[PDB]
Short mmCIF file of C-alpha atoms in Angstrom, two decimals:
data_model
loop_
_atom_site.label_atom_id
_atom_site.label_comp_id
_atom_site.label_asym_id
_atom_site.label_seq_id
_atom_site.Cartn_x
_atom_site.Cartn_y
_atom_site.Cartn_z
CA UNK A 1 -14.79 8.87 4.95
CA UNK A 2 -15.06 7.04 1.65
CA UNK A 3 -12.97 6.29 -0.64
CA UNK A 4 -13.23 5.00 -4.10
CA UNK A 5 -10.57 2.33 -5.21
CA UNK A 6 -10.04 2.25 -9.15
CA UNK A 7 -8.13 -0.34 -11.17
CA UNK A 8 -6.27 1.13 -14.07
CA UNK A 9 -3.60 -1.69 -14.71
CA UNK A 10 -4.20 -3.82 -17.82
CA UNK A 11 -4.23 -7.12 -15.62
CA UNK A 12 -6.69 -8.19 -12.40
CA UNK A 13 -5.81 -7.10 -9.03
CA UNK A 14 -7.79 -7.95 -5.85
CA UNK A 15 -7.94 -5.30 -3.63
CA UNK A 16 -7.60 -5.09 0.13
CA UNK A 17 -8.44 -2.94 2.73
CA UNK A 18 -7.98 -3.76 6.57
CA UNK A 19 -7.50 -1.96 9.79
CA UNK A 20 -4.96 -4.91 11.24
CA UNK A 21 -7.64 -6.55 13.62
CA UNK A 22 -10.27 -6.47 11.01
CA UNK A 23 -11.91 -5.65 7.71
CA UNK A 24 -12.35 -2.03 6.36
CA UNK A 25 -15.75 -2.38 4.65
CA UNK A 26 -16.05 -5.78 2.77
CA UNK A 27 -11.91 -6.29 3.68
CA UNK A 28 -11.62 -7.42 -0.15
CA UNK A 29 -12.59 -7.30 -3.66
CA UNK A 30 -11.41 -8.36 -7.38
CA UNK A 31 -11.35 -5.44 -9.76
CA UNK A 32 -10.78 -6.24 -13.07
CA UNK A 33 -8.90 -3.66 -15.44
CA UNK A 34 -10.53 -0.23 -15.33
CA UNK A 35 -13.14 -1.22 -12.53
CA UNK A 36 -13.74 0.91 -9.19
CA UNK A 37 -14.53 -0.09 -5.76
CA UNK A 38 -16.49 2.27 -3.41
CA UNK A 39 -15.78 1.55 0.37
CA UNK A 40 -16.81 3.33 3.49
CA UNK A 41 -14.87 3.34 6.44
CA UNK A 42 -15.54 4.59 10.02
CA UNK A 43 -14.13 7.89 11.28
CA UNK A 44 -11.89 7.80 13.84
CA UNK A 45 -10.53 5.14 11.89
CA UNK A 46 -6.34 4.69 12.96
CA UNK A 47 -4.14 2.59 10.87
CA UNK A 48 -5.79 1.87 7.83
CA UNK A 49 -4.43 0.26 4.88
CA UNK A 50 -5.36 -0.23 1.08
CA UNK A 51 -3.29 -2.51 -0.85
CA UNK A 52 -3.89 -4.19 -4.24
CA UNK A 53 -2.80 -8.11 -4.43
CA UNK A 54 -2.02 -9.85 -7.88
CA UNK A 55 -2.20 -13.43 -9.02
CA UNK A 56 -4.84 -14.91 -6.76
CA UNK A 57 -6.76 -17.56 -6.63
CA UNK A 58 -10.16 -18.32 -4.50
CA UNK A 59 -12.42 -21.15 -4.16
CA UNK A 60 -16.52 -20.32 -4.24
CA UNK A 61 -16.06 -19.47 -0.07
CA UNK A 62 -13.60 -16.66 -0.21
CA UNK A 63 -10.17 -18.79 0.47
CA UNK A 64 -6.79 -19.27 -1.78
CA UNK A 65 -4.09 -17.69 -2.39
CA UNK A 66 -2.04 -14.58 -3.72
CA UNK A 67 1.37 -14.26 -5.09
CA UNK A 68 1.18 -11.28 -3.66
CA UNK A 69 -0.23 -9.71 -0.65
CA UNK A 70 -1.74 -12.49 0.70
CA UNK A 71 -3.72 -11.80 4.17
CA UNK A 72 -3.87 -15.43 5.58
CA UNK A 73 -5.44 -17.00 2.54
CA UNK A 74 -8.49 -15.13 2.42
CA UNK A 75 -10.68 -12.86 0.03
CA UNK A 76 -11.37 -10.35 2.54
CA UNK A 77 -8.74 -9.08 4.30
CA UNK A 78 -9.41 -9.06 8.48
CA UNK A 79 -5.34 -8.79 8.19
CA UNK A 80 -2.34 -6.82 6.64
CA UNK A 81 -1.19 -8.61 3.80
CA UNK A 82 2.21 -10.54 3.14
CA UNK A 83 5.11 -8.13 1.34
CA UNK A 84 5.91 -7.22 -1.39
CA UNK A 85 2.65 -5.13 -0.93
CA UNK A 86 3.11 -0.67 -2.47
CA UNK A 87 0.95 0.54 0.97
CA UNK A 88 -1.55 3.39 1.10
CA UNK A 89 -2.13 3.85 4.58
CA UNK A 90 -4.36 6.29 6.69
CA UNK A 91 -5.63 7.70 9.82
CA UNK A 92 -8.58 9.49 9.91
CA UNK A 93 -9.95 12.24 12.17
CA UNK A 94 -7.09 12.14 14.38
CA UNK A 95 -7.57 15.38 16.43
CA UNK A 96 -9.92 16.84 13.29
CA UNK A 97 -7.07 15.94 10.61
CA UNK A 98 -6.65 12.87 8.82
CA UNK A 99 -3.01 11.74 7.75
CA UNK A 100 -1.96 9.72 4.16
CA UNK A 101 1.32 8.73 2.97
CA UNK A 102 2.28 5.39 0.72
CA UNK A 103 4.91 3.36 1.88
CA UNK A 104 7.57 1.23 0.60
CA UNK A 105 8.30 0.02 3.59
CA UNK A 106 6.66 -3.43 3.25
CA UNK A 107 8.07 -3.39 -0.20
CA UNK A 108 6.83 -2.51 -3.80
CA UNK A 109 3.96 -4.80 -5.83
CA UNK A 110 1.85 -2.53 -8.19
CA UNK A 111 1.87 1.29 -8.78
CA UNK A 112 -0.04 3.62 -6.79
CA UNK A 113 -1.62 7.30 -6.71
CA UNK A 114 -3.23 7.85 -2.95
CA UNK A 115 -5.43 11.52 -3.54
CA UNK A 116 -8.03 13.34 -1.79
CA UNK A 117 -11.07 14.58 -3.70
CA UNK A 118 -11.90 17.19 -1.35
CA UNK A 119 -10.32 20.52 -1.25
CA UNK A 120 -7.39 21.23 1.26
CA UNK A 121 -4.38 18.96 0.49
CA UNK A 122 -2.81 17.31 -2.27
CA UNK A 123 -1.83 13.47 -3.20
CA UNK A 124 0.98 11.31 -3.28
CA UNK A 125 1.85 8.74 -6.24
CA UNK A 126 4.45 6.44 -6.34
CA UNK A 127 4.27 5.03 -10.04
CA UNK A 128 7.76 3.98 -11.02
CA UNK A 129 9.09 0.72 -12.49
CA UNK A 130 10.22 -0.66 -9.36
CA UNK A 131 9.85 -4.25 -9.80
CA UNK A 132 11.74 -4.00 -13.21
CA UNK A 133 14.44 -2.30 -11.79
CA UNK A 134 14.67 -4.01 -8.29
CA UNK A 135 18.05 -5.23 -7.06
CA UNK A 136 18.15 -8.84 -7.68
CA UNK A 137 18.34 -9.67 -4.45
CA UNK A 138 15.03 -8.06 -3.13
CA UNK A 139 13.45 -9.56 -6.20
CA UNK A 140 10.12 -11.78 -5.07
CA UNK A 141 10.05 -14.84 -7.30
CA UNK A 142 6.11 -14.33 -6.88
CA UNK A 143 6.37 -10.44 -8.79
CA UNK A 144 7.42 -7.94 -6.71
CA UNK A 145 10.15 -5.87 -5.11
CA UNK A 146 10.81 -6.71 -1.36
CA UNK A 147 11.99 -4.45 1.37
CA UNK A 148 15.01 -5.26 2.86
CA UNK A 149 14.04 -6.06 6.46
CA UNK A 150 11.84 -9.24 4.86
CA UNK A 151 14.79 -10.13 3.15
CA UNK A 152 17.38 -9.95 5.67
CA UNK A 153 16.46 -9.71 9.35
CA UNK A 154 18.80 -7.36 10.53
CA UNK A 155 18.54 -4.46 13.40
CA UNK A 156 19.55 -2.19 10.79
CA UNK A 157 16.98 -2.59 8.12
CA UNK A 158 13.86 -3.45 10.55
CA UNK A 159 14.87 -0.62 12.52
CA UNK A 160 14.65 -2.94 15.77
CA UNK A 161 16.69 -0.60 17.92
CA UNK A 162 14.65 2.15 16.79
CA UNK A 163 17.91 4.05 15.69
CA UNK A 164 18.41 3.01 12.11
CA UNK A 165 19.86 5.02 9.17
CA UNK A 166 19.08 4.99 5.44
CA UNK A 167 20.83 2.17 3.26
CA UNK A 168 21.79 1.28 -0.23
CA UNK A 169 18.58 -0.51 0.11
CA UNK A 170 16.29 2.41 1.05
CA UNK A 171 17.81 4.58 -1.28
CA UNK A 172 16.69 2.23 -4.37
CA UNK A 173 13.09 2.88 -3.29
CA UNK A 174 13.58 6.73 -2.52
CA UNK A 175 15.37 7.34 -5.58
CA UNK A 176 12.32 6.19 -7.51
CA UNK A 177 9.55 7.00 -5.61
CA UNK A 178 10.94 10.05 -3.25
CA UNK A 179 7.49 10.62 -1.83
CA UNK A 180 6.81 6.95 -0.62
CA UNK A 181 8.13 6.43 3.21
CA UNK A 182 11.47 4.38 2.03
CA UNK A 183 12.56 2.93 5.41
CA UNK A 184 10.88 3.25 9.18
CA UNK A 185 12.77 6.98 10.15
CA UNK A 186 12.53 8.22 7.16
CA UNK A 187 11.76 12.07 7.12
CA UNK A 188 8.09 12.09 6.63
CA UNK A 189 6.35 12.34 3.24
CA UNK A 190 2.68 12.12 5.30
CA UNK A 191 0.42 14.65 4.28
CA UNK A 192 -2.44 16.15 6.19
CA UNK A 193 -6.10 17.04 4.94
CA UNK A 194 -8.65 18.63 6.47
CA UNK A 195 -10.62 15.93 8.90
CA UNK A 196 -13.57 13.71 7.34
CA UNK A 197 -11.90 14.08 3.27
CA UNK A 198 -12.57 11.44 0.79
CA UNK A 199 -9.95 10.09 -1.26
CA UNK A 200 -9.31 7.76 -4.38
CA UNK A 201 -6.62 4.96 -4.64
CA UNK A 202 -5.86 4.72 -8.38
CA UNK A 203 -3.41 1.63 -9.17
CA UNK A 204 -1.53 2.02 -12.23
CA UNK A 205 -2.37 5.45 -12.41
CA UNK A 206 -0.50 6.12 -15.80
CA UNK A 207 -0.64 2.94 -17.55
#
């Protein structure tokens, strides 16, 4: 499938993409304000993920750091990255369907459309003010709204038991972005396309 990553916030982001246990494509890129980022990945592909980090800095060999979604230091990702990090995630070709959703789960860093651009399905977007309207104690002093589970380390918010309900924390995220997956059972807001579509990942998509 490809898919074709676009910057459309007014600052620098560097983009990820990663499977878990390695790179999708090049793993990482920066894309200034208004620049796009084609990227191929595999199908069959299961677990993807396409997050943007902000406030990085990398040496001339690819290592640093991000305030952000940091994935061990690196330019390209071979890892997920560190929360707060707004998730698009994937599977493709999963029984000829591929799967999307965006998550909150891991937290909230930069707005986020996730659409196909083939026929058969429609996107998701989660482009609220989260980080200006985050509880203060989710707050990331790097920039960034953090899910409750990094913050806390309880059962109840990482969902450790498996039985876990939704909590003044979730609700925060749900109430602003109600298609975004808020906590681990929430009721799904996945969407399925037809097998082998191509999508775009637009951050900031209305600033």
């Amino acid at each position: 499938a490809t898919f074709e990553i676009v910057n459309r916030c007014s600052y620098t982001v560097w983009a990820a993409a990663s499977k878990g246990d390695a790179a999708l494509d090049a793993g990482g890129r920066q894309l200034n304000s208004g620049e796009s980022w084609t990227i191929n990945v595999e199908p069959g592909t299961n677990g993807g993920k396409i997050w943007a980090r902000t406030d990085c800095y990398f040496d001339d060999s690819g290592s640093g750091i991000c305030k952000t979604g940091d994935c061990g230091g690196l330019l390209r990702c071979k890892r997920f990255g560190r929360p707060p990090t707004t998730l698009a995630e994937f599977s493709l070709n999963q029984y000829g369907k591929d799967y999307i959703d965006i998550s909150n789960i891991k937290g909230f860093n930069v707005p986020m459309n996730f659409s196909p651009t083939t026929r058969g399905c429609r996107g998701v977007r989660c482009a609220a003010d989260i980080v200006g309207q985050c509880p203060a104690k989710l707050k990331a002093p790097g920039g960034g709204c953090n899910d409750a589970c990094t913050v806390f380390q309880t059962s109840e918010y990482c969902c450790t038991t498996g039985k876990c309900g939704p909590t003044e924390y979730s609700r925060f995220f749900k109430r602003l972005c109600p298609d975004a997956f808020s906590y681990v059972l929430d009721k799904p807001t996945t969407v399925t396309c037809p097998g082998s579509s191509n999508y775009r990942v637009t951050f900031c998509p209305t600033a």
